[PDB]
Design a protein around this ligand. Structure first.
Ligand SMILES: CCCCCCCCCCCCCCCCCC(=O)OC[C@H](COP(=O)([O-])OCC(O)COP(=O)([O-])OC[C@@H](COC(=O)CCCCCCCCCCCCCCCCC)OC(=O)CCCCCCCCCCCCCCCCC)OC(=O)CCCCCCCCCCCCCCCCC
Ligand SMILES: CCCCCCCCCCCCCCCCC[C@@H](O)O[C@H](CO[C@H](O)CCCCCCCCCCCCCCC)COP(=O)(O)OCC[N+](C)(C)C
Ligand SMILES: CCCCCCCCCCCCCCCCC[C@@H](O)O[C@H](CO[C@H](O)CCCCCCCCCCCCCCC)COP(=O)(O)OCC[N+](C)(C)C
Ligand SMILES: CCCCCCCCCCCCCCCCC[C@@H](O)O[C@H](CO[C@H](O)CCCCCCCCCCCCCCC)COP(=O)(O)OCC[N+](C)(C)C
Ligand SMILES: CCCCCCCCCCCCCCCCC[C@@H](O)O[C@H](CO[C@H](O)CCCCCCCCCCCCCCC)COP(=O)(O)OCC[N+](C)(C)C
Ligand SMILES: CCCCCCCC/C=C\CCCCCCCC(=O)O[C@H](COC(=O)CCCCCCC/C=C/CCCCCCCC)COP(=O)(O)OCCN
Ligand SMILES: Nc1ncnc2c1ncn2[C@@H]1O[C@H](COP(=O)(O)OP(=O)(O)O)[C@@H](O)[C@H]1O
Lengths: 69, 49, 104, 56, 459, 121, 347, 320, 98
């Protein structure tokens, strides 16, 4: 029965270690992502949460019929 | 039997069948070519093959 | 009409034993009935029940309980041959444990 | 005789084929978790001079 | 373990493509084959689980439940094909589809490896059951029964979803292995108290706890026979499985929290066992029996000792089998006389002898006769409770006396005395009914032959 | 909100040029197979609603349903993978550029940490 | 109405919505709203009767008042900062005015009163348009300015909408009023997560639109506007009623259906914040919507109501014009939960 | 291209196929009048299409094969049983009346569709506009109740308002003794049981209400028994009418487009016939409904759409 | 902020309240709507005139155009309501109560 239908304990043991490593990495990544999101939303120095500002290419830098602009 | 002969023909509407099968075949061929091009482009960028 | 609906009357129960005095209570068609009985009996009592119980009774000891008995025998033999307490109240060696230096 | 009985009882192969496909899919799934094959502190073993993997 | 999941999804189109007079045969045969396949999960290890893939796993607590589900489907198929004889082929295939979907959701539920997937399947099980009850029931109360069944569950289970997402946001994962290895104690806080309540109350409602147990008599009495079988055998054990899984995170908060639930469980044990003494309806009597047994399981899970968990697993399996058999036995008489009143058909031992001995063996296993697995589980829980407190024996003792009382009362009322004179349409028992009874009862004895298979991971 | 404004982003591209440096989803991807299953279900529901033999009425239109769903699903999966890759890239870069907010703490062993014990009795 | 004129009016409605979506100028967004309303009024009145006139008048008055408030908010924002660009909304009084204007355009409580009356008074096609397409522009504008949005006001209106939709739906026998109240509750669910994540808002919007399109198309296929007229459908179109029952279950939010996914994501996003109490109340209140969906399912699919004799003549005739995408909308409205992670293509 | 908005935006208008000889004509007379033969003669002289009077199985003739179905699957009422027992407590009288009204509504829709699609005129042997005379005859004789009359009035109010009245209303006036004599000379045993009061009520209703009401919007040409045989006179009398009073001269292309969209889609035509008003005479329980409907789909060519029934000879199904 | 700005904003608020409160005739509500347009036009013009923004001088024109569009829409609806009931009373618009 063991030979025909099942495997040794090494296979399940090492598959369990692989699965545990994957899940632990995913957990630490989720916590890190939450912290990074909080920091970027608080500061705004990150790529994320960049709200638009007015493009300076719209400004007209020409004499304005009055020297004091 | 039918009193009137059911405008959807008793034979297949060969025009609709034709362009339906044609667009299915075209979509499949385009998807295969897109997949091959994506695989080659990805291998080219990442220095694999 | 003194009624509320054009509703069918409630039909009476159809006794399966009437048209088939040996009816097995599976289907109205005797052939399908007999074969339903046969497949249920063969795949339930013959295949799953007996063969499955035999398979369960001869499952290999993956629970590792003869192994545990053998290990216990070896440790008891070794420990009693050397005048040892045969079991220690500390599951782990206290040397690899760093208790807080003070609780005062 | 074969044609009609096959067209009548072709449905009896769906569940056995499903079981075979499930076995194959289990094999494909567990061949993706080999990151620790023959690397455990408890089962790290020297490979025999003829094999290549401790378990498939 | 897709070797079990995919054959059920293949049961689906095989049923939908089978010819009109071969649906029951094909469904029964291939469901029996699937149960034979699933029987291979009982080869459990002794230290860790069977981690098949990243999403499915199995230990010795879920393997007996999976085997019970896969075995129960063919029994429900056999019991259903009598009252659906006049039904059109399409709606017969729809009924079989409902049963198959219920099995698939249950199979994935017992092996889902993280809490959110388990929750999704746990609540997905509600839709096929509701459709079955409210579409194929007989009386006008099936609608209200389905409403009670749905809303009692959802009211207790939505806070569980909120708590689960909160837990994952705080700890980072909900995979059971990571949750167990990285577990940390709960502080004695109001926030922690309410998170405990949110984690526990869904499974309390599902067990059900004595308080929130009202949906159960309505649902089990108004349901068709297969619906009653699946409700009593498997669907009540989802709460026990969920508690035995979720409790690891809850401790040490459980010690001062479990008091109201323990008190409710024990006193309601007594109360619901006393209710069965004055039940004029057979199905309601069996339903209240289920309530009392599951209260015992709640006590076992709450006190959290290894003997408690072993007894809870054994009792869950034993009750599933016994309650299924009792419901089928009651349904045979119901199909005979078209009424559920206990005192209508009396003295049935004279006219149906073999069915009478089926009744006797079902009643014997219900009142926990040794050395059945029913008594193994009950006695393990009783010993654990005696260790918890020596005063529990009084309550436990009272319950045993009332359980034997109503079990033998039901047997005597239905089977003994003199047959009612007016009823003359009691036909001899069919081979299908006797086979169904035998297929319920033989596994119980074969399991008491080898009892370690249903004693859980603490064994 | 969070990803709406990002530097160097083309408005309605749906698939930036930098997404081609990612491995394309396999054609036997289980999500693509599920999309094809959705197409098959749409075809069957189309047959049933119009009162036609559900399994066998229109094979060309069912094939068109399946291939349309697969075709849309492939690009949907590509964009999904690209956005998740962007999320991970940005998070890693932010962690690297702000060391003081993500400091590596001292490694302690379970022989040194004192966990309180709660007996079960 | 002439088909050419009807097509022109529908395209004008759609072009107003697109102008609202593609404009960076406040005046152009206001013009888009006004164009949308101007072309939308006749469509409600396509089939002329006193009820359609009433619905058109009430809708016009509500939307005109909302346009008043929106223009006033724009002008105040201009006064306190000479900016015409749709941005953070530098003034808080203008922000409150804008929030109430857009909420009253959407139908959020306490401004919810107009929606049940207008939906009941128009046909099923105009009701479909009103309850699906007319929500995009106000929600787009709300998404664009969600940074400056006040959490206390928006969350209050969202919770009020959920409660009122759930309660009002319980009392309804007509199908159009049921759909309107469900629309109000879904609007509340959409706007609750708006200050936290607009991607979740867009996801809930798409799922709700798919379910609503499926439900209106089913109600148009089986020409039913009341509970008892839909109770007859099983005797002519059993498949339609079964599909409708599954769609109703999906609308309720029970897993593993598509409807469950938007609430599941919104709850997760809110609990990423602290925000524990409010999602709990939202779920316990969505229970009411599930209840009256189940009442409809009991009346239409899970039981068989008495029929009439003249249905035998309907048994001999087919459905003449079949609406396209009905099959696709049903499938997307039920079997899409396993594709949940694909929401990352929305941000 | 099936007619719809697309066929209207480009090309197809219907005022360019109306050729002044369309003239929807309906012939009305008391039971056992020469109205049928007069209508046939009028149709074959004018070159119009003749519509034989709609009976119980009229809808059967336009669907599937023209052969009628069983009474249990269509109609669920018989005219013979109404003549035998007009006061039976099973509700046969009003059930027959309502089924006949629905059949007449369907036939009017078909006639209007033919008129608006080909321009050719039609001749009808009765209409929904004159079916109420039998309703009033049954009510006055105690055959039906007042609730049945109210239900009929609601259905007629919500249904008949959407169509155009006929151009010409032809009435064949035959007095009650003469129609009784003709019935006696007929040979049918069942009819011979018609009391004279029933025919008098039908005649009273026709003269008092149908003709006065149709006078404000139609051309009414009364005749007598002896004037009907010479149909040439009737045809040349129709040729010299002035169709100026009805709503037909006020119809544009948009009104015709709406009406043409309505006359097809027979489900939309019959929509309001099955309103959820629970009269015991016409309401059918769930069990009987399910049984009869299941029996209906078991018919040879009725399970699927009119092009996908394999068991009536439809081939190439998998490619449609 | 000047005091003329207070007066214009108070005019807008008064017109909004007048619209909100309904007496009998619909016509008066449309008058209040047109007054709200008038106040918005005046406020926009004053702000636009005060800070010399040259290109926004056209937006009051567009505001008046769309104000006229609203006025025409309301008048058409009032025509149809009066045709149905003979009076423009809002009390008659209560069919959608049930
Ligand atoms: C998770 C795992 C997978 C699960 C996924 C979900 C389920 C599967 C997908 C669902 C969608 C697919 C189909 C939908 C359209 C079908 C509609 C229908 O009516 O079908 C009729 C049709 C039979 O009709 P027919 O033959 O044309 O002639 C008879 C008349 O048509 C007879 O016509 P009629 O007019 O007499 O019918 C009347 C009847 C008709 O009413 C219905 O049939 C109900 C329609 C189903 C609703 C579907 C809505 C959308 C799907 C959502 C599913 C939810 C799942 C989540 C769990 C919650 C459950 C609700 O209505 C009633 O009698 C009232 C009963 C009220 C009961 C209320 C419960 C209904 C809802 C339950 C839905 C659950 C899923 C059912 C799936 C299959 C159902 C056919 O059924 C089929 O034949 C199709 C079955 C599937 C075909 C697959 C076969 C492919 C080849 C086989 C081999 C496989 C691979 C081979 C390779 C191997 C190598 C060798
Ligand atoms: C000497 C023997 C005396 C005693 C006999 C004892 C009787 C035992 C037989 C009963 C078997 C119980 C069923 C349990 C099957 C286990 C299924 C699964 O776990 O095994 C699969 C193994 O495949 C097996 O071949 C399964 C075949 C068993 C199929 C059972 C069908 C029996 C039904 C017969 C009904 C009669 C049909 C006639 C109809 C009228 C796994 O696939 P795979 O991942 O690769 O294997 C991994 C291990 N390896 C690599 C070492 C091989
Ligand atoms: C009608 C006539 C009645 C009277 C006549 C009766 C005829 C004679 C019967 C009397 C004989 C009594 C039996 C005596 C006991 C002998 C059997 C015993 O030896 O087997 C047991 C074994 O029992 C089996 O394990 C029973 C299997 C349990 C049943 C499997 C389940 C079947 C599937 C059905 C679905 C169930 C779903 C519920 C969840 C599981 C012992 O366990 P174990 O010592 O270790 O194994 C011994 C072999 N070893 C040493 C190599 C290990
Ligand atoms: C029908 C069946 C329904 C199911 C029944 C479920 C029962 C759930 C009850 C949960 C039990 C524990 C909840 C409260 C924990 C402590 C008990 C309470 O007495 O607190 C005391 C405090 O005194 C006061 O009682 C405080 C609570 C006052 C408010 C509670 C009154 C609620 C009335 C009961 C309503 C019935 C419940 C069902 C509602 C539908 C203890 O003093 P202290 O050691 O300092 O605080 C310990 C907790 N700390 C450490 C986190 C602070
Ligand atoms: C039940 C599911 C409902 C789905 C709704 C319909 C499904 C089909 C969608 C139609 C596909 C065509 C749409 C766009 C294709 C090309 C246009 C391209 O430019 O779009 C870009 C990107 O494409 C779209 O934005 C994403 C469309 C993807 C829709 C599918 C996601 C469904 C949600 C998850 C449910 C699972 C569904 C599985 C398939 C049925 C826009 O980028 P950007 O200008 O920057 O966005 C501005 C707005 N933002 C930033 C606030 C988002
Ligand atoms: C069949 C009917 C059964 C119905 C039972 C349903 C109620 C279940 C018990 C309460 C469920 C709601 C719990 C909320 C979700 C838990 C999440 C959690 O615990 O996190 C807490 C949040 O805790 C809460 O906010 C709990 C608020 C509770 C509000 C909901 C009221 C529900 C009714 C309360 C009394 C009834 C509950 C018991 C009734 C039992 C059934 C009879 C910590 O969050 P922070 O805000 O960050 O605090 C620490 C950081 N400073
Ligand atoms: N609305 C109705 N209600 C009851 N009976 C009707 C109705 N309409 C027609 N009939 C019956 O149909 C039969 C045929 O009508 P008729 O045209 O007068 O005979 P014929 O076709 O020989 O000219 C008559 O017996 C008449 O009573």
């Amino acid at each position: 029965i063991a030979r025909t239908f099942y495997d040794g304990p090494e296979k399940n043991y090492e598959k369990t270690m692989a699965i545990l490593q994957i899940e632990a990495e995913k957990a630490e990544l989720r916590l890190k992502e939450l912290e990074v999101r909080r920091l970027m939303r608080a500061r705004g120095d990150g790529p994320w949460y960049q709200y638009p500002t007015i493009d300076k290419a719209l400004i007209d830098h020409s004499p304005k019929t009055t020297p004091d602009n | 039997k039918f009193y009137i002969r059911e405008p959807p023909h008793g034979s297949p509407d060969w025009l609709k069948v034709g362009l339906t099968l044609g667009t299915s075949v075209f979509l499949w061929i385009y998807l295969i070519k897109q997949h091959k091009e994506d695989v080659l482009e990805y291998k080219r960028r990442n220095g694999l093959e | 009409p003194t009624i509320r609906l054009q509703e069918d009357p409630d039909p009476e129960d159809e006794n399966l034993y009437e048209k088939n005095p040996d009816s097995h209570g599976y289907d109205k068609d005797p052939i399908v009935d007999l074969w339903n009985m046969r497949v249920v009996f063969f795949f339930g009592f013959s295949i799953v029940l007996v063969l499955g119980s035999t398979f369960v009774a001869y499952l290999p000891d993956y629970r590792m309980q003869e192994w545990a008995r053998r290990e216990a025998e070896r440790l008891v033999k070794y420990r009693e041959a050397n005048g040892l307490p045969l079991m220690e109240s500390n599951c782990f060696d206290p040397n690899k444990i760093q208790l807080p230096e003070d609780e005062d | 005789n074969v044609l009609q009985i096959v067209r009548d009882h072709w449905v009896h192969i769906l569940v056995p084929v499903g079981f075979v496909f499930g076995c194959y899919l289990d094999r494909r799934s567990d061949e993706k978790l080999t990151a620790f094959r023959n690397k455990s502190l408890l089962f790290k073993r020297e490979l025999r001079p003829n094999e290549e993997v401790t378990w498939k | 373990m897709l070797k079990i999941i995919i054959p059920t999804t293949m049961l689906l189109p095989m049923t939908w493509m089978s010819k009109h007079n071969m649906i029951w045969i094909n469904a029964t045969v291939h469901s029996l084959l699937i149960s034979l396949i699933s029987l291979s999960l009982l080869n459990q290890l002794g230290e860790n689980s069977l981690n098949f893939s990243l999403t499915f796993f199995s230990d010795s607590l879920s393997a007996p439940l999976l085997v019970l589900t896969t075995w129960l489907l063919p029994l429900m198929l056999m019991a259903s094909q009598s009252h659906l004889s006049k039904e059109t082929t399409t709606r017969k295939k729809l009924y079989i589809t409902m049963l198959i979907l219920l099995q698939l959701f249950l199979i994935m539920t017992f092996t889902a490896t993280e809490l959110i997937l388990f929750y999704i399947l746990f609540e997905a099980t509600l839709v096929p059951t509701l459709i079955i009850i409210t579409r194929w029931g007989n009386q006008t109360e099936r609608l209200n029964a389905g409403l009670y069944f749905l809303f009692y569950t959802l009211a207790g289970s939505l806070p569980l979803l909120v708590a689960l997402v909160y837990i994952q946001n705080t700890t980072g994962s909900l995979n059971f292995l990571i949750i167990h290895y990285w577990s940390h104690p709960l502080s004695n806080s109001w926030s922690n108290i309410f998170m405990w309540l949110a984690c526990i109350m869904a499974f309390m409602v599902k067990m059900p706890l004595y308080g929130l147990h009202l949906w159960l008599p309505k649902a089990h009495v108004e349901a068709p026979i297969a619906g009653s079988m699946v409700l009593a055998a498997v669907l009540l054990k989802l709460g026990g499985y969920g508690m035995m899984r979720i409790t690891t995170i809850l401790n040490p908060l459980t010690n001062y929290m479990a008091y109201p639930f323990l008190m409710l469980s024990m006193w309601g044990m007594i109360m619901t066992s006393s209710i069965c003494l004055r039940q004029t309806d057979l199905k309601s009597l069996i339903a209240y029996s289920s309530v009392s047994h599951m209260a015992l399981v709640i006590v076992a899970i709450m006190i959290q000792t290894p003997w408690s968990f072993m007894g809870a697993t054994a009792l869950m399996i034993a009750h599933g089998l016994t309650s299924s058999m009792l419901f089928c036995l009651a349904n045979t008489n119901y199909e005979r006389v078209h009424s559920r009143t206990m005192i209508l058909a009396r003295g049935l031992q004279t006219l149906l002898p073999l069915m009478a001995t089926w009744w006797l063996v079902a009643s014997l296993t219900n009142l926990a006769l040794p050395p059945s697995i029913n008594l193994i589980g009950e006695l393990f829980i009783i010993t654990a409770s005696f260790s918890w407190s020596n005063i529990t024996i009084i309550l436990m003792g009272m319950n045993m006396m009332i359980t034997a009382l109503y079990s033998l009362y039901m047997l005597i009322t239905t089977q003994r005395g003199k047959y009612t004179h007016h009823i003359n349409n009691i036909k001899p028992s069919f081979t299908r009914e006797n086979a169904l009874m035998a297929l319920h009862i033989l596994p119980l004895l074969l399991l008491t032959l080898n009892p370690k298979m249903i004693l859980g991971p603490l064994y | 909100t969070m990803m709406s404004g990002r530097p160097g982003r083309v408005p309605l591209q749906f698939l930036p040029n930098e997404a081609r440096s990612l491995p394309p989803p396999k054609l036997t991807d289980p999500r693509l197979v599920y999309m094809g299953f959705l197409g098959y279900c749409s075809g069957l529901i189309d047959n049933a609603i119009r009162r036609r033999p559900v399994v066998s009425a229109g094979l060309h239109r069912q094939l068109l349903y399946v291939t349309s769903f697969v075709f849309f699903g492939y690009y949907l999966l590509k964009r999904q993978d690209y956005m998740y890759a962007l999320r991970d890239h940005d998070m890693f870069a932010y962690v690297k550029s702000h060391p003081e907010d993500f400091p590596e703490k001292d490694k302690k062993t379970y022989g040194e940490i004192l966990e309180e014990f709660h007996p079960v009795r | 109405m002439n088909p050419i004129i009807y097509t022109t009016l529908i395209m004008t409605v759609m072009s107003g919505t697109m102008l609202v979506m593609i404009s960076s100028h406040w005046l152009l967004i206001w013009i888009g709203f006004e164009m949308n309303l101007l072309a939308m009024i006749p469509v409600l009145m396509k089939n002329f009767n006193p009820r359609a006139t009433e619905a058109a008048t009430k809708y016009f008055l509500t939307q005109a008042t909302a346009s008043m408030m929106l223009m006033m908010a724009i002008i105040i924002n201009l006064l306190y900062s000479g900016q015409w660009t749709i941005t953070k909304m530098f003034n808080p009084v203008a922000m409150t005015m804008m929030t109430m204007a857009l909420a009253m355009k959407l139908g959020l409580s306490p401004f919810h009163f107009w929606v049940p009356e207008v939906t009941q008074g128009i046909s099923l096609q105009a009701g479909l348009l009103l309850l699906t397409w007319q929500k995009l522009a106000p929600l787009s504008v709300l998404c664009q300015i969600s940074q400056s949005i006040n959490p206390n006001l928006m969350l209050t209106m969202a919770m009020l909408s959920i409660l009122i939709g759930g309660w009002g739906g319980l009392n309804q026998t007509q199908l159009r009023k049921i759909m309107a109240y469900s629309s109000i509750a879904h609007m509340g669910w959409m706007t609750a997560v708006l200050p936290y994540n607009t991607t979740m808002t867009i996801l809930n919007l798409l799922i709700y639109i798919t379910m609503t399109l499926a439900m209106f198309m089913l109600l148009i296929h089986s020409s039913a506007t009341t509970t008892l007229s839909l109770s007859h459908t099983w005797n002519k179109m059993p498949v339609i009623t079964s599909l409708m029952m599954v769609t109703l279950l999906s609308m309720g939010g029970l897993p593993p259906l598509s409807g469950f996914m938007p609430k599941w994501m919104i709850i997760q996003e809110m609990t990423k914040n602290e925000s524990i109490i409010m999602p709990t109340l939202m779920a316990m209140t969505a229970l009411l919507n599930l209840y009256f969906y189940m009442r409809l399912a009991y009346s239409s699919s899970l039981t068989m109501f008495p029929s009439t004799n003249n249905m035998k003549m309907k048994w001999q005739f087919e459905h003449t014009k079949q609406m396209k995408l009905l099959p696709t909308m049903i499938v997307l409205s039920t079997l899409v939960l396993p594709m949940t992670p694909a929401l990352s293509s929305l941000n | 291209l099936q007619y719809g908005p697309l066929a209207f935006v480009l090309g197809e208008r219907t005022t360019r196929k109306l050729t002044e000889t369309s003239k929807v004509i309906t012939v009305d007379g008391n039971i056992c009048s020469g109205k049928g033969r007069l209508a046939r003669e009028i149709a074959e002289k004018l070159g119009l299409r003749h519509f034989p009077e709609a009976g119980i199985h009229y809808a059967d003739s336009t669907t599937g094969d023209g052969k009628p179905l069983d009474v249990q699957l269509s109609g669920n009422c018989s005219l013979e049983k109404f003549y035998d027992d007009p006061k039976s407590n099973d509700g046969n009288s009003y059930r027959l009346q309502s089924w006949l009204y629905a059949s007449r509504l369907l036939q009017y829709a078909d006639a209007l569709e033919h008129l608006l699609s080909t321009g050719q005129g039609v001749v009808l042997e009765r209409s929904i506009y004159s079916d109420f005379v039998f309703l009033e005859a049954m009510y006055r004789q105690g055959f039906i109740r007042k609730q049945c009359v109210e239900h009929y009035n609601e259905v007629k109010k919500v249904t008949a308002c959407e169509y155009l009245p006929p151009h010409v209303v032809v009435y064949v006036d035959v007095p009650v003794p003469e129609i009784q004599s003709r019935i006696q000379k007929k040979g049918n045993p069942h009819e011979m049981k018609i009391t004279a009061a029933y025919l008098q009520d039908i005649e009273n209703a026709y003269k008092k209400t149908f003709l006065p009401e149709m006078s404000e919007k139609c051309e009414v040409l009364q005749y007598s028994a002896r004037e009907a045989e010479d149909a040439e006179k009737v045809v040349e009398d129709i040729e010299y009418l002035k169709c100026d009073k009805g709503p037909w001269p006020d119809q544009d292309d948009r009104t015709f487009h709406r009406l043409r969209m309505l006359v097809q889609n027979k489900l939309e035509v019959l929509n309001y016939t099955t309103i959820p008003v629970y009269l015991p005479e016409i309401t059918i329980g769930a069990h009987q409904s399910d049984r009869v409907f299941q029996k209906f789909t078991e018919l040879p060519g009725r399970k699927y759409s009119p092009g996908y029934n394999e068991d009536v000879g439809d081939k190439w199904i998998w490619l449609k | 902020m000047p005091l003329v700005y207070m007066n214009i904003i108070m005019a807008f608020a008064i017109a909004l309240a007048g619209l909100l409160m309904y007496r009998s005739h619909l016509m008066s509500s449309l008058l209040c709507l047109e007054g709200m347009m008038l106040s918005l036009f005046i406020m926009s013009t004053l702000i636009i005139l005060n800070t010399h923004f040259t290109l926004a001088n056209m937006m009051p024109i567009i505001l008046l155009v769309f104000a006229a569009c609203e006025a025409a829409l309301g008048l058409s609806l009032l025509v149809m309501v009066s045709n149905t009931y003979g009076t423009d009373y809002v009390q008659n618009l209560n069919l959608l109560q049930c």
